[PDB]
Backbone as numpy.savetxt, mean C-alpha at the origin, in Angstrom:
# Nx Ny Nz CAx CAy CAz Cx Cy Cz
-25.34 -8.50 6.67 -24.74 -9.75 7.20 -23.26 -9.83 6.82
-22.78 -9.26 6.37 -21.04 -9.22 5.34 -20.56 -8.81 6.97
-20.54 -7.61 7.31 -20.26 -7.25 8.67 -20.05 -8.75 9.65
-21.15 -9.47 9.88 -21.14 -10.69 10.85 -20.11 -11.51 9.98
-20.11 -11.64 9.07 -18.93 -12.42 7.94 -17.48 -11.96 8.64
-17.22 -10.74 8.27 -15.87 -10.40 8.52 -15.51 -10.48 10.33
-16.61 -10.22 11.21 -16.21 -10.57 11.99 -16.42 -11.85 12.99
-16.64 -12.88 11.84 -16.52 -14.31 11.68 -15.14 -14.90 11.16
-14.67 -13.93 10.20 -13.10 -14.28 9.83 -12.07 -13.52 11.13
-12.62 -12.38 11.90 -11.31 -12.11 12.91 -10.95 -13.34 14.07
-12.63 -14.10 14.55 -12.71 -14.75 15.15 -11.72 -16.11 14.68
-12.23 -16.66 13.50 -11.15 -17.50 13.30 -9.63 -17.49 12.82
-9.44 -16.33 12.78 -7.92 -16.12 12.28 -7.33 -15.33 14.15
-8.32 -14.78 14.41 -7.29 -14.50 15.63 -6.97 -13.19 15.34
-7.55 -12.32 14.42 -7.04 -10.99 14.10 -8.31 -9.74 14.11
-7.42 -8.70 13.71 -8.46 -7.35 13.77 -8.01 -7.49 11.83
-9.28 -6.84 11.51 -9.70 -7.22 10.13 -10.28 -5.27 9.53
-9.63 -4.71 8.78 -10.29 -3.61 8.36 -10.28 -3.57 6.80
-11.62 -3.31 6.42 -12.11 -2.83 4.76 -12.82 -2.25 4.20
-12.09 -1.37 3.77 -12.99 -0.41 2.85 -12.84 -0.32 1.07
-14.22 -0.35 0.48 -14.92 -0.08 -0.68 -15.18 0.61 -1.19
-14.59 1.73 -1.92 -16.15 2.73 -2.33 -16.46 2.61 -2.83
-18.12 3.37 -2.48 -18.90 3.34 -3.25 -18.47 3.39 -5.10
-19.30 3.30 -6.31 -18.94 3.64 -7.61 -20.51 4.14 -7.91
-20.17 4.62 -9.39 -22.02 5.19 -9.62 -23.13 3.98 -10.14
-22.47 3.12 -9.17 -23.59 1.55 -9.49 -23.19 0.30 -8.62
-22.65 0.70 -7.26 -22.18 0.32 -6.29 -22.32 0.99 -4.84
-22.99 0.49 -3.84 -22.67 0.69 -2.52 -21.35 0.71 -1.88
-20.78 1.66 -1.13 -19.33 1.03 -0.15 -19.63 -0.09 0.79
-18.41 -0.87 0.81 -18.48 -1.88 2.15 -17.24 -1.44 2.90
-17.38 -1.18 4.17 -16.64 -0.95 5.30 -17.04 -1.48 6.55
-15.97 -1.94 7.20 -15.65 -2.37 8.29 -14.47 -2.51 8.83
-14.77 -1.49 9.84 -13.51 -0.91 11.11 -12.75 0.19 10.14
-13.33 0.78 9.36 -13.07 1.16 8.23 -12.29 2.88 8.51
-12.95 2.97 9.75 -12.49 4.34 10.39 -11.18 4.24 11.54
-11.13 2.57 11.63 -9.37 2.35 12.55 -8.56 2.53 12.11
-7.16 2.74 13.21 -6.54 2.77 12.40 -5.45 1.95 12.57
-4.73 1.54 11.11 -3.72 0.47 11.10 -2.58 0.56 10.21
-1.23 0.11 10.62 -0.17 0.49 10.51 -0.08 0.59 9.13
0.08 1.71 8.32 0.68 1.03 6.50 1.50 0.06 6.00
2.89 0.18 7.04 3.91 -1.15 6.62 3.62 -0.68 4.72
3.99 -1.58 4.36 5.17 -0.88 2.70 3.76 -0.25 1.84
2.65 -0.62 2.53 1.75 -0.01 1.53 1.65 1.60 0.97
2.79 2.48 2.00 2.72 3.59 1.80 3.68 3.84 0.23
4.62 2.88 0.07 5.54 2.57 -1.32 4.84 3.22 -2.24
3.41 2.95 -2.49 2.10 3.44 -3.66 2.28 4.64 -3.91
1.42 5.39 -2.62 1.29 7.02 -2.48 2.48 7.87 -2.58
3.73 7.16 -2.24 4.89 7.71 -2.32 5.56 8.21 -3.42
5.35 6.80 -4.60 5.58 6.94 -5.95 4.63 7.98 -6.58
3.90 8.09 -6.25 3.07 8.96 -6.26 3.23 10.57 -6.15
3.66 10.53 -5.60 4.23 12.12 -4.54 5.46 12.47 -5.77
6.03 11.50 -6.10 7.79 11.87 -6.42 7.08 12.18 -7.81
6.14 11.15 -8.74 5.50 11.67 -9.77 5.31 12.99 -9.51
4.31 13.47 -8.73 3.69 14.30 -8.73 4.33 16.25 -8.82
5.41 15.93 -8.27 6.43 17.03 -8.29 7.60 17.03 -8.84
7.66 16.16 -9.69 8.57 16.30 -10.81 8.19 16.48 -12.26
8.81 16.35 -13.30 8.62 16.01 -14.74 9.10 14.56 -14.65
8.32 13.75 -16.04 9.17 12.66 -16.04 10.29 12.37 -16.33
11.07 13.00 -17.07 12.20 13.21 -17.09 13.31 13.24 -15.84
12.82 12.97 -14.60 13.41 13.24 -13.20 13.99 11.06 -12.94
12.73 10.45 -13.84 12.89 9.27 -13.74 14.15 8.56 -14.12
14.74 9.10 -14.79 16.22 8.90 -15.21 17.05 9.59 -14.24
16.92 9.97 -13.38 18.00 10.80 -12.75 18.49 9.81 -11.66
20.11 9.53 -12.41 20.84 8.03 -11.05 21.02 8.72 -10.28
20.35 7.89 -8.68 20.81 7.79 -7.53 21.79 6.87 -6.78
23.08 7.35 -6.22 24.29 6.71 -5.89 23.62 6.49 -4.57
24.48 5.43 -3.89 23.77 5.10 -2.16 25.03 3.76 -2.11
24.75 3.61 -1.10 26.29 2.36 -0.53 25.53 1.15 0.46
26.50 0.60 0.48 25.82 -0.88 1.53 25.26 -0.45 2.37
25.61 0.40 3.31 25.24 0.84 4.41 24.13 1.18 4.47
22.84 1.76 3.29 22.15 2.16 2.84 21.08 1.31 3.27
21.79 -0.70 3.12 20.60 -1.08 2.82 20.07 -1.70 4.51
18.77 -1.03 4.51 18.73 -1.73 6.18 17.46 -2.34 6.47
17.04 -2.45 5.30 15.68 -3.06 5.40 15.61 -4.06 3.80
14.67 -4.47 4.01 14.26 -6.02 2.85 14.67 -5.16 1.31
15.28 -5.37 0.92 15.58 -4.59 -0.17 16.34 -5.29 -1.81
15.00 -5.97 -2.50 15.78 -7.43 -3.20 16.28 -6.85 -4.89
16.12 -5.16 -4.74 16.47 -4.99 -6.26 17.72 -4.33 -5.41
17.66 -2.89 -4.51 18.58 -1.96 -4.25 19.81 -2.67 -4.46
19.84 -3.92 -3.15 21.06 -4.33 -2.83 21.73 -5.23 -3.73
21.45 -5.38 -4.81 21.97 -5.75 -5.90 22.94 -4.68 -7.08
22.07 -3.48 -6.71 22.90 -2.51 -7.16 23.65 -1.24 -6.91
24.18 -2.13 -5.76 24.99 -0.98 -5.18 25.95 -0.26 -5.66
26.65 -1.08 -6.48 27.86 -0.66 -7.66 27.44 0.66 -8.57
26.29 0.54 -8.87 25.75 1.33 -10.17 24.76 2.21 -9.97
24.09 2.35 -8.83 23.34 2.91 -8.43 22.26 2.80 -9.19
20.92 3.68 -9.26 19.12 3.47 -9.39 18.73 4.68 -9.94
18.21 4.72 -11.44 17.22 5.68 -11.38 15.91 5.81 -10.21
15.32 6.99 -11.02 14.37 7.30 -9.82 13.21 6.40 -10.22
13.54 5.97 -11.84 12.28 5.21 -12.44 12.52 3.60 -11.94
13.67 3.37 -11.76 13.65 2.02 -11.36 13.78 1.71 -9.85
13.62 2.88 -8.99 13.64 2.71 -7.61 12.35 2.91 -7.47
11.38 3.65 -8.28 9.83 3.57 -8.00 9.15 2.20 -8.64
10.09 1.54 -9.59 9.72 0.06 -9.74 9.82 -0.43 -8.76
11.03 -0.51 -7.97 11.63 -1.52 -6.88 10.50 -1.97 -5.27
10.18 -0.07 -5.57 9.76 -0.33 -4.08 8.22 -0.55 -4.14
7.55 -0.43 -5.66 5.88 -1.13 -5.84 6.57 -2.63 -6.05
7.27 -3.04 -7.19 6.80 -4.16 -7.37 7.34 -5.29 -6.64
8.55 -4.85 -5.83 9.58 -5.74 -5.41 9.30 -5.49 -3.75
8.56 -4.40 -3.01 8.40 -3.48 -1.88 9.55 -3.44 -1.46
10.27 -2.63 -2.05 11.99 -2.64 -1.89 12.44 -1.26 -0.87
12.73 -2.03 0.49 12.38 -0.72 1.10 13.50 0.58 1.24
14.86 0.21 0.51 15.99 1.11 0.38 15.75 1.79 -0.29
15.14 1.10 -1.81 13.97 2.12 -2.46 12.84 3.16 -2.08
12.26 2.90 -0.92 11.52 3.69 -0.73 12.39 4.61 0.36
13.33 4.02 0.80 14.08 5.55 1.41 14.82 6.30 0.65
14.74 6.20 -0.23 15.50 6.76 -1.46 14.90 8.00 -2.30
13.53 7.03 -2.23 12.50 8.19 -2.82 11.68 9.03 -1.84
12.18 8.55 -0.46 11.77 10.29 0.48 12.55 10.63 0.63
13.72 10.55 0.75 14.80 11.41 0.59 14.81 12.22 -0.61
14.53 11.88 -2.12 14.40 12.69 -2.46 13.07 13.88 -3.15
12.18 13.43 -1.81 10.83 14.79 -1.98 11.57 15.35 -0.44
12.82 15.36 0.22 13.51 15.91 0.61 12.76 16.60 1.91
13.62 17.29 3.11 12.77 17.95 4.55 13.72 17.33 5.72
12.66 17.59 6.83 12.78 16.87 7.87 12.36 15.28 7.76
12.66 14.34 8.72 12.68 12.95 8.84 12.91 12.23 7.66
13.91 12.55 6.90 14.38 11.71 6.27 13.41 11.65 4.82
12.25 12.45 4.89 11.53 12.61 3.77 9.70 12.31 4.31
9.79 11.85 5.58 8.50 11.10 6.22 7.76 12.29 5.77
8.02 13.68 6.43 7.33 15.00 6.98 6.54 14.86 5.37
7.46 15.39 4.43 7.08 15.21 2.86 5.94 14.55 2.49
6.19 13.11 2.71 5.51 12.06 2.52 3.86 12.19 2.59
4.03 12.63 3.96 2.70 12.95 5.06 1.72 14.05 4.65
2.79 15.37 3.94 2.45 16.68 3.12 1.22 16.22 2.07
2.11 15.34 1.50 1.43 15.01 -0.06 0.23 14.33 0.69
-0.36 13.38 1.28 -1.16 12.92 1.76 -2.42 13.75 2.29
-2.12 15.07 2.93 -2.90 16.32 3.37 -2.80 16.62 1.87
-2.01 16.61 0.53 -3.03 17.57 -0.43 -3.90 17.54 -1.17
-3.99 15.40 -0.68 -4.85 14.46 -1.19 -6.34 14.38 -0.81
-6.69 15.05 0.63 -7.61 15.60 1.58 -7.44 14.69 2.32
-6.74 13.66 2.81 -6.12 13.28 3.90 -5.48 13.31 4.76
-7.01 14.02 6.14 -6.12 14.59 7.37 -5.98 13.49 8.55
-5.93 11.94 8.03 -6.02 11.17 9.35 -4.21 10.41 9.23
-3.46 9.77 7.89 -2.69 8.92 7.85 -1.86 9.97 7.99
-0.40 9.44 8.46 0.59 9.88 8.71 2.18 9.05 8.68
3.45 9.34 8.10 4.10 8.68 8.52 5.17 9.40 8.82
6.08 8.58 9.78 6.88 9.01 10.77 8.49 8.88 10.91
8.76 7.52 10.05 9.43 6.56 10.47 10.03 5.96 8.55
11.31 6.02 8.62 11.64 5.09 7.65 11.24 3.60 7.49
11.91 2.80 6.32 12.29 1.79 6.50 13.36 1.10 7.16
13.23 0.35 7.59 11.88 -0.41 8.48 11.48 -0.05 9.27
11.70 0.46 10.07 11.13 1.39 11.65 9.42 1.40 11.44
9.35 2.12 10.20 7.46 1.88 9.77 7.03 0.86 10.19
7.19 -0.08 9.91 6.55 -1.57 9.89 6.14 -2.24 11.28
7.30 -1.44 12.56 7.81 -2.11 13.90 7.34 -1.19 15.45
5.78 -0.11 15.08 5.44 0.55 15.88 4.64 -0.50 16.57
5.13 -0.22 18.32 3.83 -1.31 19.26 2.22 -0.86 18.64
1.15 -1.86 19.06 -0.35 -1.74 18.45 -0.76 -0.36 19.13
-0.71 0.74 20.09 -0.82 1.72 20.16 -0.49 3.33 19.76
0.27 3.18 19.19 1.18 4.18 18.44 0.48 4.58 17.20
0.10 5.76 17.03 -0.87 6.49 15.85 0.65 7.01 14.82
1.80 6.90 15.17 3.25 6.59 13.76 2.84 6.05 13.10
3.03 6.21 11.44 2.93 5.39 10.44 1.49 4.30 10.40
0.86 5.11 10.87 -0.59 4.80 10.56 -1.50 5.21 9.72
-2.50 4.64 8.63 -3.70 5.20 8.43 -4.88 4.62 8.41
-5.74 4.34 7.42 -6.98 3.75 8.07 -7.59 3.05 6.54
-8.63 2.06 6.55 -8.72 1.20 5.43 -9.62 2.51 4.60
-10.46 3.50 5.30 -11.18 4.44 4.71 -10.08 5.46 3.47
-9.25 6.18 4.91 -8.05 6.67 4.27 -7.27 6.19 3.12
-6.57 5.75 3.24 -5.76 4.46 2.18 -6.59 4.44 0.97
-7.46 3.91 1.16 -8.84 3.42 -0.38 -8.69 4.70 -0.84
-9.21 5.99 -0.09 -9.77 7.22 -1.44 -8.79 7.65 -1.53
-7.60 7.83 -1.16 -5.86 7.89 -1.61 -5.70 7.34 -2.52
-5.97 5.77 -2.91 -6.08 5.26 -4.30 -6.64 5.28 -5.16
-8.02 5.79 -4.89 -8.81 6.13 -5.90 -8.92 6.92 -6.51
-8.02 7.97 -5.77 -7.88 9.60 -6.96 -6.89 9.38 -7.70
-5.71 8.15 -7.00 -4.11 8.49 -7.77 -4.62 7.23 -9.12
-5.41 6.25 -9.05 -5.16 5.61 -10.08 -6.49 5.41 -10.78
-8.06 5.73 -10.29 -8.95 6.17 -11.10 -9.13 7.50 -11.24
-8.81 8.31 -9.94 -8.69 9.85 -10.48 -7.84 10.77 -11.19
-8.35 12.09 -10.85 -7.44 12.78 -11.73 -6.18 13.41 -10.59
-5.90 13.03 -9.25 -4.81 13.18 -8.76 -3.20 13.32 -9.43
-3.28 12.51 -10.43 -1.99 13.00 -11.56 -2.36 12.69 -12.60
-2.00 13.60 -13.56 -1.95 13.41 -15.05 -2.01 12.15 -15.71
-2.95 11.61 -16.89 -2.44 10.07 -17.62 -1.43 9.82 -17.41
-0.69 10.45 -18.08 1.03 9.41 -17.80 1.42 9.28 -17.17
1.68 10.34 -15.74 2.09 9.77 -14.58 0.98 8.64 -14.27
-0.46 8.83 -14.14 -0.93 7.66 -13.50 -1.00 6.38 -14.56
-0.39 6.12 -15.42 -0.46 5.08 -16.27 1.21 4.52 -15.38
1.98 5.26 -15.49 2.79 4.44 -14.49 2.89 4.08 -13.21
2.25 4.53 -12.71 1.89 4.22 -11.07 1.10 2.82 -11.38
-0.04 2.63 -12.07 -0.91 1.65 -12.42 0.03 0.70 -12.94
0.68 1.13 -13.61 1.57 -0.25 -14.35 2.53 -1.12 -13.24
3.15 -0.40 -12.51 3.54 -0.55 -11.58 3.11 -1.62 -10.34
1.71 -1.51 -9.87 1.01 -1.84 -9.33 0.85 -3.14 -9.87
0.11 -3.12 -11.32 -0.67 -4.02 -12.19 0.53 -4.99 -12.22
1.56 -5.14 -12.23 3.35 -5.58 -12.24 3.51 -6.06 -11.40
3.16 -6.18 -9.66 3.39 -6.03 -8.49 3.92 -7.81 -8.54
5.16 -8.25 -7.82 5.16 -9.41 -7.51 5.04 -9.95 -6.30
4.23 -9.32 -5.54 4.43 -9.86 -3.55 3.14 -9.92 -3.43
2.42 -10.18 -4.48 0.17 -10.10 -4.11 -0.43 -10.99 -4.09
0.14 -12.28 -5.12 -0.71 -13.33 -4.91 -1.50 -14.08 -4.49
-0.93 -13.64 -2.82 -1.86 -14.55 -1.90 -2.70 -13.90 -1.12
-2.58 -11.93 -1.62 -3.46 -11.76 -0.67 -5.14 -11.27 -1.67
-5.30 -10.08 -1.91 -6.26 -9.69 -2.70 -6.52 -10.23 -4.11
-5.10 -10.45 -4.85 -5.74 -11.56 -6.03 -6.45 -12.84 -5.76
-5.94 -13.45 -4.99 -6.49 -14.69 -4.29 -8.00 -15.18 -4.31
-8.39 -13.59 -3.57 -9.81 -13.59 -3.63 -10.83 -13.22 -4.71
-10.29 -13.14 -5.82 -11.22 -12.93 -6.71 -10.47 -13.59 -7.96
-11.90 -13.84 -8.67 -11.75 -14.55 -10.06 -10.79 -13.86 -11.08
-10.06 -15.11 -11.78 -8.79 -15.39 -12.66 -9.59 -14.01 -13.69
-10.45 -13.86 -14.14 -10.97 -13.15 -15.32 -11.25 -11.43 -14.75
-11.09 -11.37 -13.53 -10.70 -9.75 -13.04 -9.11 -9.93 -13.16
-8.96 -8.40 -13.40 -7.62 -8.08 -13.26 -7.47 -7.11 -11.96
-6.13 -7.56 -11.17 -5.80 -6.68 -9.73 -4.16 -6.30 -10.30
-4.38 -4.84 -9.71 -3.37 -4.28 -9.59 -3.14 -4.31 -7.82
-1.76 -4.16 -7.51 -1.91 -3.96 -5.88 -0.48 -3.47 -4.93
-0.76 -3.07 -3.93 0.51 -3.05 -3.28 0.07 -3.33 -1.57
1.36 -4.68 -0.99 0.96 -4.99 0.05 2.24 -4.29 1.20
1.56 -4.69 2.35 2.34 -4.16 3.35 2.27 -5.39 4.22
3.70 -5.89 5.11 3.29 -6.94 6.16 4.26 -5.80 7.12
3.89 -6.42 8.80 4.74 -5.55 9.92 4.37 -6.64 10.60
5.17 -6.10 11.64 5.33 -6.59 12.95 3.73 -7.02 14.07
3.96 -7.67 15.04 2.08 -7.68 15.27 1.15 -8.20 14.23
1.83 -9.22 13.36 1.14 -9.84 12.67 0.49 -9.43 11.61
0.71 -8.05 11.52 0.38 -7.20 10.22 0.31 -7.55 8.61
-0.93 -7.89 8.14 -0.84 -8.18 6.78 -1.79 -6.96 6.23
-1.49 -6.05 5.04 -2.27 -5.39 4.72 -2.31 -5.72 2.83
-2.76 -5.06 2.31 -2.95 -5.25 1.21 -4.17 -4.13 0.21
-3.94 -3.41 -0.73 -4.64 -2.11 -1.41 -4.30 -2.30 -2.98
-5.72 -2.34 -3.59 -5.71 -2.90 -4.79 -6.49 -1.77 -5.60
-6.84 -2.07 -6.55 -7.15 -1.90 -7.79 -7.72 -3.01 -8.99
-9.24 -3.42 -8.23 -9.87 -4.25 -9.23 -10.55 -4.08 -10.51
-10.32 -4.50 -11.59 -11.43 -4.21 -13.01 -12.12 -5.61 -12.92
-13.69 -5.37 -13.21 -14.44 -6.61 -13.29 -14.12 -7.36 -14.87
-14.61 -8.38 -15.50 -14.52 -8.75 -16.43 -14.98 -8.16 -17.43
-15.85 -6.88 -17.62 -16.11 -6.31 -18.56 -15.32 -4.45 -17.94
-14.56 -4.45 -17.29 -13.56 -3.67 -17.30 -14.09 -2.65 -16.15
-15.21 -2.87 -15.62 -15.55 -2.10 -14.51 -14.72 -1.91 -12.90
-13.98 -0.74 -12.66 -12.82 -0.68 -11.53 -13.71 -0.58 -10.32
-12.54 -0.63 -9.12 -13.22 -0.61 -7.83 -11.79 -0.54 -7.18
-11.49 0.21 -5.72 -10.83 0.35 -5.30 -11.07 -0.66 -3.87
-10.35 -2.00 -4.01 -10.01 -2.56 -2.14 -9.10 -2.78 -1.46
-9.49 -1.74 -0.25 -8.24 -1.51 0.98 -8.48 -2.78 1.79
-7.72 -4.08 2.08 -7.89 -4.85 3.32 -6.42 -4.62 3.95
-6.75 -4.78 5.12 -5.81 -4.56 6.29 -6.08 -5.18 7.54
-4.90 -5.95 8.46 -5.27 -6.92 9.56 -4.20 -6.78 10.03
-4.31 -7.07 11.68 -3.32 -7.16 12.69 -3.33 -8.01 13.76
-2.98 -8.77 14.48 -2.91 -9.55 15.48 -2.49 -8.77 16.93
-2.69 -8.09 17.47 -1.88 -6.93 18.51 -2.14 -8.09 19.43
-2.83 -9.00 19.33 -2.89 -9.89 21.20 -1.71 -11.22 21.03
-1.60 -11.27 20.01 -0.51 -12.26 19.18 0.89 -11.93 19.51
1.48 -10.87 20.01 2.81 -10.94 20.22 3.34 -10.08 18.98
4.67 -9.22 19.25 5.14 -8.28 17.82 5.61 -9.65 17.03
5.43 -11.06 17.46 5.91 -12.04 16.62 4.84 -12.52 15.88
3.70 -12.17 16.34 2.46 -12.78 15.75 2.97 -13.00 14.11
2.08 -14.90 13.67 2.44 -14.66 12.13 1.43 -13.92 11.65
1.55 -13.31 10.41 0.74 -12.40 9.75 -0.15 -13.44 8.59
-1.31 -13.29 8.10 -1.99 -14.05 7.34 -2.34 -13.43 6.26
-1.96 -13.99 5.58 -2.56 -13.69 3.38 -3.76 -14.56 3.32
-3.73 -15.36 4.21 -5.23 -16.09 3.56 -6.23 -15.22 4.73
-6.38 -14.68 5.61 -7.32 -13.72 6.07 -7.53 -12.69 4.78
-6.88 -12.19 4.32 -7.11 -10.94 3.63 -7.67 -11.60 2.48
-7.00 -12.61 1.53 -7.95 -13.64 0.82 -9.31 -14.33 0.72
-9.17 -14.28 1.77 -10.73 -14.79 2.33 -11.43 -13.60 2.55
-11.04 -12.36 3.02 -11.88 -11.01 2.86 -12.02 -10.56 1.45
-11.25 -10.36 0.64 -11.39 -10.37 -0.97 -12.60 -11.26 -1.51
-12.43 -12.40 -1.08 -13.42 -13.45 -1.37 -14.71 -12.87 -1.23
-14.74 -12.43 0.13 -16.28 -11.95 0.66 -16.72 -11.06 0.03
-15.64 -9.97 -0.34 -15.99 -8.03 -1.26 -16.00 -9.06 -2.28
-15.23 -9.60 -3.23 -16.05 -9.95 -4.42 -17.03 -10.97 -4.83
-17.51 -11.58 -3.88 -19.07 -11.78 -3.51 -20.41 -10.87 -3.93
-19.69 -9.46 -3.29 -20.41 -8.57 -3.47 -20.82 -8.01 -4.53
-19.26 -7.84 -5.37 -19.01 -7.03 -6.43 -19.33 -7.56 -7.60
-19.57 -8.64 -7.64 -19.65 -9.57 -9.20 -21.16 -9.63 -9.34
C-alpha cells in the first residue's frame, strides 16, 4: 500500500515522485519509479566530492584554486565571496555539499580534468562505481535546465541511492576520505525542508539536495536511526506538465520521508 501512498502524494502535489531504499541485513527496499529517470540538479555535488577524494591524496585539499568573476555563473554563495583569494580544494568541496555552491562544483570538474569541462570525468567515476545508467553532461547551471525529455544530466532514484551507499556506508573510499564526505553532508545547510523534515528530531540526516528547472526538487540522504542504525534515502520529483517554471516542492519530498520513515522506525 506505500506504492498507492506515494502515488497519492504525486496526485496531490501535481508531480512525478521517485524513491529508492535499500534494502539493509534487517530491512526490505522501498522503491518507486525507482528505475526513472530524473535530472540530478546539484545532487551530483556528493559523488563529485567524491571522485576528487578519490584520486587524490589529502593533501591535494589544500591546493588554492585562483578563478575570477567571470567564473561565477551559477548560485554560488561561498565562491563569489572569494574571488580575491581564491579556494582550496577542501573548501570548494565544502562549498559545493554544504552551501551547493555551484562555481564550486565547476571547479572541482575542472579539476578531475578531460573533455566537457570535467562532466566526461565526472560520469567515468560513476561507471567505476557500477553505474551504467547516470550521466552528466553539462556544467553549472546548464545541469539543472535540461527540457523533461533529455537523458543529460540524468540518473535515477535506484542509481543515486547505491552511489551513496558505497561512498558513505561503503568501502568506495577509504575512512578518512569517507569521514569527510559524511561530514560534509552531515553539515549540509540547504536540507531542512526536505528529507530531515520527514523524520524524527532523534535520527540524524546527513544530505545533499538538488532543485532544477520543471519544478525539480530532489534530495539524497544518509539516515542513522536512534540507536545508530544507517539507511540510505534517494527522493526525487519533477513537475514536467507544470511549465520549466513549475514551483518545485520540499514539502512533497517531506512528506515522502515521512512515509519511508514510517517504514523504517
Amino acid at each position: 500500500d506505500l506504492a498507492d501512498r506515494f502515488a497519492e502524494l504525486e496526485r496531490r502535489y501535481d508531480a512525478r515522485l521517485g524513491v529508492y531504499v535499500p534494502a539493509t541485513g534487517t530491512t526490505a527496499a522501498i522503491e518507486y519509479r525507482a528505475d526513472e529517470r530524473f535530472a540530478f540538479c546539484s545532487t551530483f555535488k556528493a559523488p563529485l566530492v567524491a571522485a576528487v577524494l578519490h584520486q587524490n591524496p589529502l593533501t591535494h585539499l589544500d591546493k588554492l584554486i585562483t578563478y575570477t568573476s567571470d567564473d561565477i555563473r551559477s548560485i554560488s554563495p561561498v565562491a563569489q565571496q572569494h574571488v580575491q583569494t581564491g579556494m582550496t580544494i577542501g573548501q570548494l568541496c565544502d562549498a559545493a555539499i554544504r552551501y551547493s555552491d555551484g562555481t564550486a562544483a565547476n571547479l572541482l570538474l575542472a579539476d578531475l580534468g578531460g573533455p566537457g569541462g570535467g562532466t566526461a570525468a565526472f560520469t567515468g567515476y560513476l561507471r567505476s562505481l557500477g553505474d551504467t545508467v547516470s550521466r552528466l553532461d553539462a556544467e553549472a547551471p546548464e545541469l539543472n535546465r535540461d527540457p523533461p525529455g533529455d537523458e543529460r544530466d540524468t540518473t535515477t532514484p535506484h542509481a543515486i541511492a547505491l552511489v551513496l551507499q558505497q561512498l558513505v556506508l561503503g568501502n568506495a573510499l577509504p575512512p578518512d576520505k569517507r569521514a569527510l564526505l559524511t561530514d560534509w553532508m552531515a553539515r549540509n545547510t540547504t536540507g531542512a525542508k526536505r528529507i530531515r523534515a520527514g523524520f524524527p528530531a532523534d535520527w540524524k540526516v546527513i544530505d545533499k539536495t538538488g532543485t532544477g528547472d520543471y519544478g525539480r526538487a530532489n534530495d539524497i540522504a544518509v539516515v542513522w536511526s536512534p540507536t545508530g542504525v544507517p539507511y540510505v534515502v534517494a527522493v526525487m520529483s519533477d513537475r514536467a506538465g507544470g511549465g520549466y517554471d513549475a514551483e518545485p516542492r520540499e514539502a512533497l519530498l517531506a512528506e515522502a520521508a515521512t512515509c519511508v520513515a514510517g517504514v523504517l522506525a
